[PDB]
Amino acid sequence: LTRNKGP
Amino acid sequence: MYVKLISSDGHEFIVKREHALTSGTIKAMLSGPGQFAENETNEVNFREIPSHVLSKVCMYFTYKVRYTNSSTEIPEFPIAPEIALELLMAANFLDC
Amino acid sequence: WIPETLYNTAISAVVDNYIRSRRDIRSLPENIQFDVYYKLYQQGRLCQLGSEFCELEVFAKVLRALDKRHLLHHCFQALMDHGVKVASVLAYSFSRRCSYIAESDAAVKEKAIQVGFVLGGFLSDAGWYSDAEKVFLSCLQLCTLHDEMLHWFRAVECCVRLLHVRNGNCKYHLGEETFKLAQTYMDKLSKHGQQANKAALYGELCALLFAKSHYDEAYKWCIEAMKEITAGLPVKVVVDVLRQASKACVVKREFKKAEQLIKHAVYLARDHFGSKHPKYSDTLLDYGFYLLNVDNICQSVAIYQAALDIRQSVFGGKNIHVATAHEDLAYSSYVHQYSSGKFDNALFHAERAIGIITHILPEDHLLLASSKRVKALILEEIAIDCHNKETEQRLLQEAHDLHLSSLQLAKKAFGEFNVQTAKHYGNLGRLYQSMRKFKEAEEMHIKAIQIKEQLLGQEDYEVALSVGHLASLYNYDMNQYENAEKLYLRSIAIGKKLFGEGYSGLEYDYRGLIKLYNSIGNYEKVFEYHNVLSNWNRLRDRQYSVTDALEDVSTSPQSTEEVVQSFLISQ
Amino acid sequence: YSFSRRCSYIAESDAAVKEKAIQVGFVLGGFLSDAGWYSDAEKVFLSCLQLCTLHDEMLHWFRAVECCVRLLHVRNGNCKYHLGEETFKLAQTYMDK
Amino acid sequence: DVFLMIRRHKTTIFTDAKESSTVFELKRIVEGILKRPPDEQRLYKDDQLLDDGKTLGECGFTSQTARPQAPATVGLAFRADDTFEALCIEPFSSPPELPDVMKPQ
Amino acid sequence: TSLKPRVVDFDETWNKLLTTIKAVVMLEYVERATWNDRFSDIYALCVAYPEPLGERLYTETKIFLENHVRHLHKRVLESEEQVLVMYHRYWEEYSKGADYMDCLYRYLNTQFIKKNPLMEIGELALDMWRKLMVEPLQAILIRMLLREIKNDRGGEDPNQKVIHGVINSFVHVEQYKKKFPLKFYQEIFESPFLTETGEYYKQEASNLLQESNCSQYMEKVLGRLKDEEIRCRKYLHPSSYTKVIHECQQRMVADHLQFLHAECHNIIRQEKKNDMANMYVL
């Protein structure tokens, strides 16, 4: 878990 | 206490009034000017319903009144295939 | 044990003696006919029910039973799951009927249009937009051969309904021409001293321009649509315009107005149509879109699932309307459980969406782009949670194939310069970061920033999300901290401006800055970012207060013209 | 369902129509038992047994026990073992008669 | 309980009676409906007079052949002081001739 | 003939229905056999071929009701100073006729109205008796309906049947709306009635103290309150029973309680047990 949710 | 469900053919079907109010339409036809018939039993003319199918309607009345809220298993109403279509339109018109 | 009605008993008997009276059932009253055909459905006689529903004369009398329409939409669906192409046969039969009565008086031509309008509206409600388009094209032809006032109103209404079936089928190139033709007919109406209402047409144009990611012009056109709503409009038209205006306000970053717009739309649908209507499910779907874009995420899953359960009860499986609810609930459940990581219910709804859309739509259709994206996003996040390298490199490969398919569809339809293809680029950048591919992820993310910055502004939600993804790529993966710091600050500032300090996407930026400053220096920044992250967690403890949005809308919030006027006076 | 409904209407008919219905019911229920539709073959054989146990004639016990040796078959395959013992008892009752 | 259709010419009394009840109670029902004396009423069970002494169960009416679904008919005749009258039950009607669909034609 | 969809004309059958529905709503005498025949005519119109003439039947029925209640409104405008008794005489007939007409239109109610903005025929007639009979006579009817109850308090004998029927008629129109089944009663008559009773129990109630002392007043407080209780049973809907009594005692006790409690010091010391029960029931 290093980035945010996908667009 | 009895009503006289006269069919189109002329066969009067003297059935109990409590049986006749199973159908909403007969209850409506027995309300208002339809209840003003003083001659005891009320005559309900059915010039669109033939006699052979109104007889099955009255049998259904005596069937549903006797088999209402029954504790045991209930049998289906015996309806002939050759009368099923005519008794389908008779069941819609009578709302029973 | 209660006796069955003599009506139901005779329905059972007429069905059982079916073929000997199958041509006599068509002589029955309309409600009796619907009950006979519904009894054929209930007994499992889908073959004879399909053989009768493929006939336009039989099905037109079935469509007259409005109160039992919710049954018909179900029955129809079973036939379309039975393998019998009822919608295609009905549309072809209506086209043949129109071709036969092309030369006839207007008293029988108007009758077929009204039969065509109800059948086309049924197929559009059922979701057979490719089959509802033929019916409406035939109706538009009937309005096109002659030129008069009544035919002009029918042509305007038919172009309004034809725009809707060209929007859900994702044919926008024909949709713009449909709107131009509708505008031509309304100009011809206006030159004869008569004005027709433009609320429904401009609402469908707002849907068209929202689908084409032209959010600014869609917002302008939903303002134009809402400028012309009166008390004489049908409830369905007002609901549709309110939904489209709310969605355009959401993507225009005007979250305040969209609140009252979508809440009044949901209340209007729940009041007039009820809690088990497909239009109310559409309102719930748009309300979930609102709640997902507001960062009221945990509530939104409870609204998509409410939307899905209505669309799964009114419509059976293998339908585009239940598939859109599946793909939207799959995304929100992926969004809601992104931090938790339990993508079990999310993947099930994603595979149900593609498993439907691949069955009822062609492989090159755009609804696969919005469905393959969600499944690939769930698959990518699942595989980084499991420790099997041979399974991770398979799930990321499958997600790579799905992202490439979605990108191909988006680039074929919208072109390379569009918001949809750019968020596909950003999703590919995230996937390439997960694939341990560095330069390719950087190129994808830079292209996503370039396309999402000019077409959405410098301070939009989507561009902030892509800036956060690029910052995580530079920080956790590539070690390019000099740019990653600025990108993280930009993403935090934009998220603070649009959403505030309770934005759920700020955690992945705060921890990124914490790690970056841990491995570059300035520990006094690390301590205060730990303090800010603790404050953010404490604020999210109160912002996490779960309610029911069906109670947030409550009962009788405002008036119909009150919400429209409040939206209009604020530009 | 069609067999049961069309077959309950000839309970008071003559012996020829009743035995024709019993033969048709044996053929259809045997087909549905061979095809594996034991839940849909029990109803056929139940209607057959109903029409066999109406008249007090000699061949009716033979047809009734021939119904019951097939109800017990379509109840074992349907895993309705609690009706199986009572079906055996009723078949043994007609064998006693 | 037993269910009957007391038919005379075209009237059809859809009444009910107990299986242990006698013919006198049924004639009293017809008193209560057609206001006729029981002495002017001869009831026929398929061309067979019912004596007033016996019960409905003995003469043939049971709770199995006279169910509420399909009540068993019984005749009725009136005296008119002249040697009574014969049974003149008029059949209801003929349902439309619905032929067998598999008949070769 | 049979109960099958047949091609029927609307003019002849609708004239045949028009005669009997004119008979019903005015409570005239229509033949029972004709009454049963018109059920079959309603069925034949509702499932007619090739299009169901149910919407047309509803439209012409509403047009007939438009021509009917408007005619009754004009007629009751003609009888000036007799508007209350004429309104009640027409209202009893219209209520029973609308009930019987709902009975006659049962097939249109169940198969068209409750399946397709559309109101049931017996409740369309009641809503139309609202919007074309009592809404044009809203302030007019209350002008002397509130006078007769005021006259009854002044020592008169208004008609029990006429007064109770008109006041209950506002509730009877609200029979079908399940949302607010007493809104019309509580916004057309009850709110004007409550203020008018308050004025009669403020101006006249203050006149009791002008010439009578407290001991005489307490007997007279129970005199008017129980007389209000008797007339509540007569001219008032039972849902409004409690709130009028609370309002009446509010405007002649709760605005004079400072005199009662000041006098309450005297009744305690003297032990006036005769008026002790007066303070107990209030």
From Swiss-Prot, chain B:
Overexpressed in prostate cancer cell line PC-3 and breast cancer cell line SK-BR-3. GO terms for cellular component: Cul2-RING ubiquitin ligase complex; Cul5-RING ubiquitin ligase complex; cytosol; elongin complex; nucleoplasm. One of its GO terms (molecular function) is protein-macromolecule adaptor activity. One of its GO terms (biological process) is protein ubiquitination. Transmembrane segments: none annotated. The keyword Transferase does not apply. InterPro entries: ELC1, SKP1-like, SKP1/BTB/POZ_sf, Skp1_comp_POZ. Keywords: Host-virus interaction, Nucleus, Transcription, Transcription regulation, Ubl conjugation, Ubl conjugation pathway. It holds the Pfam family Skp1_POZ. Pathway: Protein modification; protein ubiquitination. SUPFAM superfamilies: POZ domain. It is found in: Nucleus. Gene3D superfamilies: Potassium Channel Kv1.1, Chain A (3.30.710.10). SIII, also known as elongin, is a general transcription elongation factor that increases the RNA polymerase II transcription elongation past template-encoded arresting sites. Subunit A is transcriptionally active and its transcription activity is strongly enhanced by binding to the dimeric complex of the SIII regulatory subunits B and C (elongin BC complex). Belongs to the SKP1 family. This is Elongin-C. It comes from Homo sapiens. The lineage of its organism: Eukaryota, Metazoa, Chordata, Craniata, Vertebrata. The gene is ELOC.
UniProtKB/Swiss-Prot annotation, chain C:
Keywords: Cytoplasm, Cytoskeleton, Membrane, Microtubule, Nucleus, Protein transport, Repeat, TPR repeat, Transport, Ubl conjugation pathway. It is found in: Nucleus; Cytoplasm, Cytoskeleton; Membrane. Pfam families: TPR_10 (PF13374), TPR_12 (PF13424). Pathway: Protein modification; protein ubiquitination. SUPFAM superfamilies: TPR-like. Gene3D superfamilies: Tetratricopeptide repeat domain (1.25.40.10). It comes from the Eukaryota. GO terms for molecular function: microtubule motor activity; ubiquitin-like ligase-substrate adaptor activity. E3 ubiquitin-protein ligase activity of the CRL2(APPBP2) complex is inhibited by APP. TPR repeats lie at residues 43-76, 113-146, 199-232, 281-314, 326-360, 422-455, 464-498, 507-540. GO terms for biological process: intracellular protein transport; intracellular transport; proteasome-mediated ubiquitin-dependent protein catabolic process; protein ubiquitination. GO terms for cellular component: Cul2-RING ubiquitin ligase complex; cytoplasm; cytoplasmic vesicle membrane; microtubule; microtubule associated complex; nucleoplasm; nucleus. Transmembrane segments: none annotated. Rapidly degraded by the proteasome upon overexpression of a C-terminal fragment of APP. SMART domains: TPR. It is a peripheral membrane protein. InterPro entries: APPBP2, TPR-like_helical_dom_sf, TPR_rpt. This is Amyloid protein-binding protein 2.
Curated annotation (Swiss-Prot), chain E:
It comes from the Eukaryota. GO terms for cellular component: Cul2-RING ubiquitin ligase complex; Cul5-RING ubiquitin ligase complex; cytosol; elongin complex; nucleoplasm; VCB complex. Disulfide bonds: none annotated. GO terms for biological process: positive regulation of proteasomal ubiquitin-dependent protein catabolic process; protein ubiquitination; protein-containing complex assembly; target-directed miRNA degradation; transcription elongation by RNA polymerase II; transcription initiation at RNA polymerase II promoter. Residues 1-65 form the Ubiquitin-like domain. InterPro entries: ELOB (IPR039049), Ubiquitin-like_dom (IPR000626), Ubiquitin-like_domsf (IPR029071). Pathway: Protein modification; protein ubiquitination. It is found in: Nucleus. Heterotrimer of an A (ELOA, ELOA2 or ELOA3P), ELOB and ELOC subunit. The elongin BC complex interacts with EPOP; leading to recruit the elongin BC complex to Polycomb group (PcG) target genes, thereby restricting excessive activity of the PRC2/EED-EZH2 complex. (Microbial infection) Following infection by HIV-1 virus, component of a cullin-5-RING E3 ubiquitin-protein ligase complex (ECS complex) hijacked by the HIV-1 Vif protein. Belongs to the Elongin B family. This is Elongin-B. It comes from Homo sapiens (Human).
UniProtKB/Swiss-Prot annotation, chain F:
It comes from the Eukaryota. It is found in: Nucleus. Its main location: nucleus. The Cullin neddylation domain restrains the RING domain of RBX1 in the E3 ubiquitin-protein ligase complex; this restraint is removed upon neddylation of the cullin. The chain holds residues 2 to 300 of 745 of the full protein. Belongs to the cullin family. Keywords: Acetylation, Host-virus interaction, Isopeptide bond, Nucleus, Phosphoprotein, Ubl conjugation, Ubl conjugation pathway. GO terms for biological process: G1/S transition of mitotic cell cycle; intrinsic apoptotic signaling pathway; protein ubiquitination; SCF-dependent proteasomal ubiquitin-dependent protein catabolic process; ubiquitin-dependent protein catabolic process via the C-end degron rule pathway. GO terms for cellular component: Cul2-RING ubiquitin ligase complex; cytosol; nucleolus; nucleoplasm; SCF ubiquitin ligase complex. The gene is CUL2. Neddylated; which enhances the ubiquitination activity of ECS (Elongin BC-CUL2/5-SOCS-box protein) E3 ubiquitin-protein ligase complexes. Neddylation leads to structural rearrangment in the complex that allows interaction between the E2 ubiquitin-conjugating enzyme and the acceptor ubiquitin. CBC(VHL) complex formation seems to promote neddylation. Deneddylated via its interaction with the COP9 signalosome (CSN) complex. The keyword Ubl conjugation applies. This is Cullin-2.
